Subunit: 415 residues, 2 copies
Amino acid sequence: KTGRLFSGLFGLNLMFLGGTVVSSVALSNKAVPERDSQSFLCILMLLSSVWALYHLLFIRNQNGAVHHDHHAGAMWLKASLAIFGVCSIILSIFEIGHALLLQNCEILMDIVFFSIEIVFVSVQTVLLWVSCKDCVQMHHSVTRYGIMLTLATDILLWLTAVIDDSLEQDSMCWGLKQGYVTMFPFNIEYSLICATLLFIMWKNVGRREXXXXXXXXXXXXXXXXXXXXXXXXXXXXXXXXXXXXXXXXXXXXXXXXXXXXXXXXXXXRKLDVTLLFVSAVGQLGISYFSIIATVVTTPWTMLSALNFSNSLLLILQYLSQTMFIIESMRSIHEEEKGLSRRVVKEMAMFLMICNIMCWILGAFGAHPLYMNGLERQLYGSGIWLAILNIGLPLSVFYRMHSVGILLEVYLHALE
Amino acid sequence: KTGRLFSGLFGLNLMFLGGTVVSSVALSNKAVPERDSQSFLCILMLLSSVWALYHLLFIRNQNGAVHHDHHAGAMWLKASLAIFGVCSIILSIFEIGHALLLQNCEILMDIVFFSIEIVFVSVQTVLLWVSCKDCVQMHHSVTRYGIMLTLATDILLWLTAVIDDSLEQDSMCWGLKQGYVTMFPFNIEYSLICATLLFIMWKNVGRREXXXXXXXXXXXXXXXXXXXXXXXXXXXXXXXXXXXXXXXXXXXXXXXXXXXXXXXXXXXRKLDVTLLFVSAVGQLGISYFSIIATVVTTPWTMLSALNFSNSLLLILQYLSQTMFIIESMRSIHEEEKGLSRRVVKEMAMFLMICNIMCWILGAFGAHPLYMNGLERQLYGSGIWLAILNIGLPLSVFYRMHSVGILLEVYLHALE
């Protein structure tokens, strides 16, 4: 415990000293240059990678790393790491080609920068796939320092990717860049998954006592290229269809979990429940901003109320699905010490399909808020784009975390 | 527990719907007017007050409110509520006189606004003094709704006070206003104390099983008027003396707790430890912003390094004092199941004096960052002033929370 605090304050101080540098570039833009946020990030990343090799080769293979058979983080948290990691590779690959085939500008600073991120992701997703379930017993003092070095590295990468001035508006430059970067950012989503995996490992250090993997990263490159197919195939009726797909999918979902919560009344792990509540920003903060943004517009179009009906319906699906999960999760833990079970079984099976239908349209779909333009006229586009890059990766992470709890109550009902 | 979640999601949704309104005024400033942040706040406040009377008269006086004798929040958390509450009254009293004795402008919207805040504070500090230690058993469903209504009311008051455009720069208008509002804001500090008192009560609802008070609010009005005496008595040598007082007080404090942490090595409640870590922003976020802000200035004055030495010394007093508290707090909890004790006793006695010396200079002292002007030239003054109103009330709350733990280890050492 004493080594945990001696690692904790080093872990707390480092991200504050890191997050100061990457923010002060954005607050001033004139005195401090753009290279010091990046140079510091690269140096921090290099040392985090060589620890991961040192933990892999010379530490884990020795005797004294106790396996955690029981829960230790499940398959989807490993799988969504594997999917969202390799899409961040291609997004850096498509970036680094643009830097080469470019007008006469700065050379080799960003090119040496993005190449290290290709190294840093690739060695980290290997580590977290292997060391997801380990409980280290041999060298406590270096591993507790080694994790918080990597944990502080990701949060700065999350903070650097949020505050990004996309100053928008040549036969090969335009088609490679303009229809491309209007996507769901993947390196942000990769940063949250490595954040929520390193913390469970850091909590569980010093605790007393291949044909099914190659299909994930193979088909994801077709799914990542499917995202580019949507933006390169471009309306007031197409976006009306784009808002129709999210409306028609979640329509029965509000009617589903409402009856499901009532059956838990007629019938009568600790880190999981907070991860459901931090995700409230992705479905309440981004929506209430838009509901106000349709009300105080003057003309009241026939699709402004379509935008208002979308964001209001997003709130009700949140508050129905959340209470269904926790009332089910209490209904399993108490069973340590009927046809209503058929109601719970038929309900969780329906929710798992629509959440996946929401997730693929969420991540590998259109970025629907640059197409929106209503609140982009109301709020400033330089600061409204920051609110998208906080909530939209949180909302997608809300789905992949919720599906795994729904699979647990489905399996518990059928057995 | 089920009524707790049914109160929790109502409590979570309300502050997001509230915090959306008060922020969207600040992001646009043109479509939404200034009155709707305020009108909504006033309506929310009125309903929170009449619950507090209803809990006071008709609920607590009935049988079935179990006293918590043991800890339940101690005297200083009640006392700092009593001090910082009544200074918020005079700050609203001095505001409402300026609104009357004023140029021809808007009438009676702000005047009806600030009068309700005089009501809302005064009925709340009566309630939290009385109901600090109660564990309600009679009407669970209304009290869990009643607390989260008041808890969401304070956080919007914390958020409204942060985002405030002080567009600075008549024989009775100037001396009443200009030397006055450059103070440590008290209504922000009042909001945090009511936040950390309502949450312990909300956690402890439904748990199974006057001559020493009049001196606080009496002498605080002399101390609040002592704050106005400093700004109305006004240099490059005076601010050099102002930075000298903070330097000379915390100088031995870094040398104190360093030797104190070593004696805990030579010798060999759960909500308290997180409140020590949220307070890191008040002593690390505001300092690292300034250390960069002295480095990238060109001329390197003979007092720029004085400003750099101040903020660097603030970090080392944080990391010395924090590990001393937790290593002492573990050293008391383990004693359920020597002259080194004289080292701990002489150390905690010295720290309690300098923290109080830091606190009075912290709260009832000069606001040293409007006098600073260095980073006000580097960062924008419209957004640097927001960072002061996050960290400076957190840093003052860090002191009053730390003193009470130091009094506990001092009493435990002497007995």
